[PDB]
Amino acid sequence: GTFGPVHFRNQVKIRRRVDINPGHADLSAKEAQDVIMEVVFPNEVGARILTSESQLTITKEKKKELQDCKIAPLMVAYMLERELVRKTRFLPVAGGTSSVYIEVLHLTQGTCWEQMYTPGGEVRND
Amino acid sequence: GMEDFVRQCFNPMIVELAEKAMKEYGEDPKIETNKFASICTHLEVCFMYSDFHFIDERGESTIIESGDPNVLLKHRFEIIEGRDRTMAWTVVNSICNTTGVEK
Amino acid sequence: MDVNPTLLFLKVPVQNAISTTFPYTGDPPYSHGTGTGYTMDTVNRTHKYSEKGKWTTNTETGAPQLNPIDGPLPEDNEPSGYAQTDCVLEAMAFLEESHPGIFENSCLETMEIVQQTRVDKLTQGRQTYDWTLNRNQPAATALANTIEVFRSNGLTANESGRLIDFLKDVMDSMDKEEMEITTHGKKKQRLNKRSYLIRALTLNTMTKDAERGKLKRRAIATPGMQIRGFVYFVEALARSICEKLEQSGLPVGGNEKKAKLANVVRKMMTNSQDTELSFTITGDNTKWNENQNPRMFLAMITYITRNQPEWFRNVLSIAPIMFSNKMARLGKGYMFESKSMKLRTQVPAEMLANIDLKYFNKSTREKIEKIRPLLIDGTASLSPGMMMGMFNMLSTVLGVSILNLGQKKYTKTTYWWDGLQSSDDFALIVNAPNHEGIQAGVDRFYRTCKLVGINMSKKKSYINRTGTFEFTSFFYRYGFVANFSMELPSFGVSGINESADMSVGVTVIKNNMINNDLGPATAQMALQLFIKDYRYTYRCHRGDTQIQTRRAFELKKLWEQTRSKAGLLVSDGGPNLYNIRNLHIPEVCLKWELMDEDYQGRLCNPMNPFVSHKEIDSVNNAVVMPAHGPAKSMEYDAVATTHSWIPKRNRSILNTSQRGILEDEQMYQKCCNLFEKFFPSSSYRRPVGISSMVEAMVSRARIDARIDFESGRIKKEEFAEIMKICSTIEELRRQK
RNA sequence: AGUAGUAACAAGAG
RNA sequence: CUUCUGCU
Numbered sequence: 001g002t003f004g005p006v007h008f009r010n011q012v013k014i015r016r017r018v019d020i021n022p023g024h025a026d027l028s029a030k031e032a033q034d035v036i037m038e039v040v041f042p043n044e045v046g047a048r049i050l051t052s053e054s055q056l057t058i059t060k061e062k063k064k065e066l067q068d069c070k071i072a073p074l075m076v077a078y079m080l081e082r083e084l085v086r087k088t089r090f091l092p093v094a095g096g097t098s099s100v101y102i103e104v105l106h107l108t109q110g111t112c113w114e115q116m117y118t119p120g121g122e123v124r125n126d
Numbered sequence: 127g128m129e130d131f132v133r134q135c136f137n138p139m140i141v142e143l144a145e146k147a148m149k150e151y152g153e154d155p156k157i158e159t160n161k162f163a164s165i166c167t168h169l170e171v172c173f174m175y176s177d178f179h180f181i182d183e184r185g186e187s188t189i190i191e192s193g194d195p196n197v198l199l200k201h202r203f204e205i206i207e208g209r210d211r212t213m214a215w216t217v218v219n220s221i222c223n224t225t226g227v228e229k
Numbered sequence: 230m231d232v233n234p235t236l237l238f239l240k241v242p243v244q245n246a247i248s249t250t251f252p253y254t255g256d257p258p259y260s261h262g263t264g265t266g267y268t269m270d271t272v273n274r275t276h277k278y279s280e281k282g283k284w285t286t287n288t289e290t291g292a293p294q295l296n297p298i299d300g301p302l303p304e305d306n307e308p309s310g311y312a313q314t315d316c317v318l319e320a321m322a323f324l325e326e327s328h329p330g331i332f333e334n335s336c337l338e339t340m341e342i343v344q345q346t347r348v349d350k351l352t353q354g355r356q357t358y359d360w361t362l363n364r365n366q367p368a369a370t371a372l373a374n375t376i377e378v379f380r381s382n383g384l385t386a387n388e389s390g391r392l393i394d395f396l397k398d399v400m401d402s403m404d405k406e407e408m409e410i411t412t413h414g415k416k417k418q419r420l421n422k423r424s425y426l427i428r429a430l431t432l433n434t435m436t437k438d439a440e441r442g443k444l445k446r447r448a449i450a451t452p453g454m455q456i457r458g459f460v461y462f463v464e465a466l467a468r469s470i471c472e473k474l475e476q477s478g479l480p481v482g483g484n485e486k487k488a489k490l491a492n493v494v495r496k497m498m499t500n501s502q503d504t505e506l507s508f509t510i511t512g513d514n515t516k517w518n519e520n521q522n523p524r525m526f527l528a529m530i531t532y533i534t535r536n537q538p539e540w541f542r543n544v545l546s547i548a549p550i551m552f553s554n555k556m557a558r559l560g561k562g563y564m565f566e567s568k569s570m571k572l573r574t575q576v577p578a579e580m581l582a583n584i585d586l587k588y589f590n591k592s593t594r595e596k597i598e599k600i601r602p603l604l605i606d607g608t609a610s611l612s613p614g615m616m617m618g619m620f621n622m623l624s625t626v627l628g629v630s631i632l633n634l635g636q637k638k639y640t641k642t643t644y645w646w647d648g649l650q651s652s653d654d655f656a657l658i659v660n661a662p663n664h665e666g667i668q669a670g671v672d673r674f675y676r677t678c679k680l681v682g683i684n685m686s687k688k689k690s691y692i693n694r695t696g697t698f699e700f701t702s703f704f705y706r707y708g709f710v711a712n713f714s715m716e717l718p719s720f721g722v723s724g725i726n727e728s729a730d731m732s733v734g735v736t737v738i739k740n741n742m743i744n745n746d747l748g749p750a751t752a753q754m755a756l757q758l759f760i761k762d763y764r765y766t767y768r769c770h771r772g773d774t775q776i777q778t779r780r781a782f783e784l785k786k787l788w789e790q791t792r793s794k795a796g797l798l799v800s801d802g803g804p805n806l807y808n809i810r811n812l813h814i815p816e817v818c819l820k821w822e823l824m825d826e827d828y829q830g831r832l833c834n835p836m837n838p839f840v841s842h843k844e845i846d847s848v849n850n851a852v853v854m855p856a857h858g859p860a861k862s863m864e865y866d867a868v869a870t871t872h873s874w875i876p877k878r879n880r881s882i883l884n885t886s887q888r889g890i891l892e893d894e895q896m897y898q899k900c901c902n903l904f905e906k907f908f909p910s911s912s913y914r915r916p917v918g919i920s921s922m923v924e925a926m927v928s929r930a931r932i933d934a935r936i937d938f939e940s941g942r943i944k945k946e947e948f949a950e951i952m953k954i955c956s957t958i959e960e961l962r963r964q965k
Numbered sequence: 966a967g968u969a970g971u972a973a974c975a976a977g978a979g
Numbered sequence: 980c981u982u983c984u985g986c987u
């Protein structure tokens with residue numbers, strides 16, 4: 001991340017719904033669970049079947065990454081759910097509402113100041 | 127009428143399996159008697175399609191009516207039918223994920 | 230030079246400095262002893278506030294009942310529960326007219342809920358009165374005990390797993406002539422129909438501990454398993470209705486609630502005419518629960534469920550019917566002492582109906598004399614009022630209906646009103662051409678509330694110009710003011726475990742910075758104070774410190790062995806690396822790049838014995854109770870580490886008659902934990918099926934053994950042994 | 966005695 | 980006596 005100057009201003013934070021976990025943009029709740037189940041409990045999947053190129057790619061990548069993993073399956077499923085299912089919460093925001101910005105909301109937007117911050121990594125085109 | 131005929135013309139576990147499946151399906155066993163008999167015939171035939179059939183050490187299919195418990199015989203057929211959906215589909219996934227056959 | 234902090238209000242507006250007026254840095258006033266006195270006082274007050282009603286005697290329970298509905302109108306500002314059914318129905322009808330289809334849509338959704346709700350949902354929550362033991366038990370334990378009792382008595386319809394079937398079973402049990410229960414010496418007890426009914430409608434009572442802002446203590450009530458089933462559907466319907474009401478701020482919570490209130494109030498202030506004077510009334514309603522009669526909720530449920538299927542109306546209306554016949558258990562009892570003989574003793578509440586009055590003081594003697602007529606089998610009949618009513622959403626709907634009645638099209642006058650209502654708290658905005666109009670509107674609103682039984686507390690309410698008010702401890706001064714004192718108890722060590730505490734502490738600091746106006750300098754100092762408290766509480770001081778503690782040797786050895794000290798977790802004596810930059814990063818991930826590989830492997834070893842995982846519903850989640858309001862579920866980001874252990878459990882039940890229950894719990898765990906070894910997804914998703922566990926586990930074992938053999942994960946000898954054992958298990962189940 | 970305050974503690978169950 | 984317990 002990159003830090004810019006801190007500007008003292010009269011911050012007016014409005015309460016609205018913002019993204020906590022962006023999840024996967026091409027998968028819905030159901031799609032996420034379908035991949036989760038298939039990756040963590042391939043035998044207990046049930047009648048559900050993967051029906052999307054995105055689901056197949058994610059399942060293949062996670063299975064390749066989770067080879068010989070002795071971690072407790074419940075933790076793996078919980079972490080996958082965190083990474084995939086979209087989660088939103090009402091927060092008093094003044095700047096960007098993206099997850100990359102909401103997570104550092106405490107550091108960037110204050111009651112009488114704003115910290116110019118540019119989170120690392122790539123940003124979603126949308 | 128019909129329920130008594132099914133009780134008298136089928137094995138205890140067969141009628142038990144059929145009736146339980148009826149309960150999980152939603153229909154009452156004492157009302158939809160034709161369905162009950164059809165289910166019992168189906169279950170019976172499915173289970174017969176695996177009775178006495180085993181695989182020996184050479185991988186060849188053999189038939190053993192008097193099943194010896196000390197003989198290392200692997201059943202040739204695994205009955206998916208007669209179990210709860212969940213358990214059945216669990217067996218389906220176990221077979222697909224290990225053998226590789228499409229689900 | 231007498232310093233006086235109150236004089237600070239001469240310059241800073243009270244609201245901007247409201248945090249100063251909160252003593253939340255001190256210990257909350259706990260309650261000492263039994264809650265019998267408070268419960269009897271609450272019953273006596275509830276019956277006194279409806280003393281002019283009709284007295285009847287129940288034909289089933291045989292206990293006296295009071296019906297204040299349609300009683301005389303209030304001739305004084307004294308709190309009155311004589312609600313008028315026609316006025317309540319008229320208010321509901323006007324509410325429906327103002328929001329067409331609200332009841333139809335809410336009923337459609339609630340109906341579906343009823344169809345899809347499972348029995349497990351009753352496991353949520355805590356401290357339910359288990360009628361099989363006459364004691365408070367966890368919701369899951371009370372539910373299981375009730376289910377086991379019903380099965381032993383022939384009520385076998387709850388096996389479908391649908392909550393409506395369990396409710397049906399409850400109804401059949403109510404019609405049962407005799408009930409059989411088990412006690413433990415595993416004795417059997419028989420309950421007659423009357424006694425069953427009394428113990429099925431009984432509500433246990435305790436004292437509200439750690440309540441702030443009140444001098445006198447109060448008593449709260451918990452219902453049994455039978456009532457909880459219908460209460461869930463009634464609350465679901467009320468919630469569905471409240472979601473569509475603009476003035477109802479109850480269903481929402483957190484920032485969503487503040488956002489709703491700010492938007493609603495803003496719009497209310499806006500649509501107001503420029504030529505119309507505006508005033509705002511702030512204040513609670515006195516004796517809210519003691520005056521909300523269950524018959525009124527029955528009337529509202531019947532009106533809401535108009536045109537709906539008869540089964541839906543019956544299932545929704547069962548809850549108010551049972552609550553109208555509810556009996557409150559007095560409680561622990563009373564304690565006596567002899568100074569001359571120097572000895573103490575305890576009299577159970579069940580003995581108060583027959584005990585002599587010479588042992589009590591004047592106040593308790595009067596309370597006993599006044600409650601004696603209503604005392605039935607150690608429980609007092611409590612038909613009037615709603616003792617610690619769970620119908621918070623329904624009461625909010627009623628209050629909103631009264632609020633909605635203040636539109637200019639209903640008042641048919643120059644003045645009009647609107648506002649916000651949540652439970653017993655409200656904020657009313659009245660617009661009128663002049664002060665006379667404001668007074669007329671206030672009087673009309675007060676009288677209409679009295680009509681419905683609701684009654685504004687003139688003692689703790691005030692009216693001022695529109696723009697500033699207080700609602701549920703949120704102080705609005707042209708915009709909600711960020712009060713920080715309310716969140717002070719949330720600081721410090723949460724007390725979950727060595728790992729969850731750190732993540733929760735930093736998460737609390739971050740949340741307060743975001744929401745409660747915590748300055749960055751204050752955030753830094755807070756972080757420092759929290760780390761110091763954390764270290765002094767878990768004895769995890771820095772390895773290079775000379776502080777002496779029973780855990781100092783292991784920490785010292787670990788500090789000497791590690792090469793990169795900065796990588797050690799704070800729980801292992803490592804230095805604190807947190808700051809405003811990374812309050813959102815879990816410490817394991819924050820120090821991962823600095824941790825030594827050997828220590829990193831030891832700390833995150835998945836085979837470690839300390840880490841334990843329950844259902845996913847209880848993974849990385851904790852229950853935190855703030856200064857005001859009920860318990861809330863807080864989700865924290867933490868990595869599974871050896872520090873994520875579980876604290877010891879209370880063993881006081883180990884030397885009592887009910888010790889067998891704990892043993893049973895152990896047995897159940899011994900079986901459920903084994904099932905997890907057969908069905909790995911048992912925790913992530915609830916398993917389904919009608920077959921016995923043993924049958925499912927043996928079948929799964931046979932399938933897995935075959936699949937492993939075919940794949941080659943096991944040898945011929947291992948497979949032969951497995952099946953041999955499976956056949957032995959089947960024979961063991963058959964032999965019995 | 967003391968804590969404390971509408972009722973307790975100043976150990977309790979074997 | 981000794982055993983058991985500090986939210987049951």
